[PDB]
């Protein structure tokens, strides 16, 4: 259909990310490509302010799930890319155990043949010595699944699902997400029957960069549907 045709080769992608975590103000802006026909994501992410305030594997989700590989039998549950070129805002709180809370809100669409990602992160309630502040997290990130509902009242969808970052001493830091997406056009867009995204994601460093940054690569496939 219409958004599906325009994710059929690798497409460019755009983030641009404006953070207030307890008053630490920073930016972040990244560029890569999807090639949804594989889920595959290939990007690398600058802090432009200087030095990130938090740490970057707690930015991973916040930083275009339009790029998900949706198999064909499950082609007609794919709200994301029946949303485009005109797009969708996705907004999310994130609640990290026994710390603070990030609130997101981001407009994901098409300018021009590039697909970009605006967000505005609001982070509240973190303890300056938490994990999250502390910096006690590990540089990577585990495998996990997204739960999609459709959310009729507001012709788009919910999603929820848990993430678990690893504190440096081996433990777990649990940052559980509730997420809403609704259309930006006011055309159809196709309202899913309940599933999910299966998520790997691998961190790394661009050996010459001295600027604070994060390169990953990701993929994401659309399941448990017949």
């Given amino acids: 259909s219409k958004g599906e045709e325009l994710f059929t080769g690798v497409v460019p992608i755009l983030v641009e990310l404006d953070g207030d975590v307890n008053g630490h103000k920073f930016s972040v802006s990244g560029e890569g490509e999807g090639d949804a026909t594989y889920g595959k994501l290939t990007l690398k992410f600058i802090c432009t302010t200087g030095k990130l305030p938090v740490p970057w594997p707690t930015l991973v989700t916040t930083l275009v799930q339009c790029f998900s590989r949706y198999p064909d039998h499950m082609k007609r549950h794919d709200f994301f ?62 495998s996990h699944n997204v739960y999609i509902m459709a959310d009729k009242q507001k012709n788009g969808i919910k999603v929820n699902f848990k993430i678990r970052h690893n504190i440096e001493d081996g433990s777990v830091q649990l940052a559980d997400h509730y997420q809403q ?41 659309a399941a448990g549907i017949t």
């Fill in 181 to 221: 997406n609704t259309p930006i056009g006011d055309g159809p867009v196709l309202l899913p029957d309940n599933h999910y995204l299966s998520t790997q994601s691998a961190l790394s460093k661009d050996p010459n960069e001295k600027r604070d940054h994060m390169v990953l690569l990701e993929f994401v496939t």
């Fill in 81 to 142: 890319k029946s949303a485009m070129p005109e797009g969708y805002v996705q907004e999310r709180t994130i609640f990290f155990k026994d710390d603070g809370n990030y609130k997101t809100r981001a407009e994901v669409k098409f300018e021009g043949d590039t697909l970009v990602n605006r967000i505005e992160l609001k982070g509240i309630d973190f303890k300056e010595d938490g994990n999250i502040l502390g910096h006690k997290l590990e540089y990577n990130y585990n």
